[PDB]
Design an enzyme around this catalytic site. Sequence first.
Site: not given
Length: 358
Positions: A135, A313
């Site tokens: 990411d 998450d």
Amino acid sequence: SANNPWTGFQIFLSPYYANEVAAAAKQITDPTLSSKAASVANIPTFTWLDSVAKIPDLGTYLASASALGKSTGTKQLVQIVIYDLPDRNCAAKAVNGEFSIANNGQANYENYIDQIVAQIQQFPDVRVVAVIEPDSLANLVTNLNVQKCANAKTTYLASVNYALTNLAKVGVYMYMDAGHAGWLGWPANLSPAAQLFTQVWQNAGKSPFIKGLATNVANYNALQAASPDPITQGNPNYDEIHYINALAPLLQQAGWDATFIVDQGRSGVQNIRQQWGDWCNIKGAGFGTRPTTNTGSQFIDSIVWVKPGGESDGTSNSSSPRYDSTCSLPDAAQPAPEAGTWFQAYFQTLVSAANPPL
């Protein structure tokens, strides 16, 4: 390629995941499901170095792996994720990560890398494979209109460069995070992605230890889908093999014969998302194909489990300072605890829905 980092090596199994899984498995009431769940501790996963506080753990894993190899007549391999960039997760909602660009973030990140290198240097008989910064780079392809990402661009590039350059000096095999088919695999994103990754490879000296790219990290895409997931409409590259087949030749043309690893740890169940971009605690996910170098593609060194299934998450509590609204979407399992912490109900479903079955 000729040199697959995994061939001839025994992967060191995370004791933290084994314990997390062990604590999780005794809570599962059905005995047949419980024994399947306990066995997940034998499946190799990546250890996330998501803070400086995790670096002493790396040291213990290297030293334990070194001893275990000598005790069993094997060469051991430790799997890590480098995941502590300043202004980490620039396109996410709310601030994450201990380092900030505004507070010497780059310099602090360099010190984080130096501490990791200093551990790895001490255990030369252990091989290390690292996924570099999930990411991060992928945001610099498609999300430069996100102001936090635009403002983070030079820091992400400099920090990733520092990691690649210095981990190479201790012989770490590295795969840069490269998003997934629904992020960079759109045909129109492929050339922009290739240009960025090749510039990064060049800035780090084209080291042969920079093996290539990691895809689907912490995501849910199929490697090879039986039929396209409806979320993929408009993208001919509807699974990871299509993405990789399309991107790899662009890197080869630059002189980088790059190879790939693909996370399948939460890919056992397809067709569970409303939109492709929904990434947080997707409900009904199952453990996918177990790690293996039998990948079915010239470009793929290994199927891997990078994100450890069962660790959240992100929280679904909108009062948390870390809250990302993606984690409250209709397809996100709720209530969910803070990112990285154990999510027992989610783990139990990952076990029940595993495909292939455990």
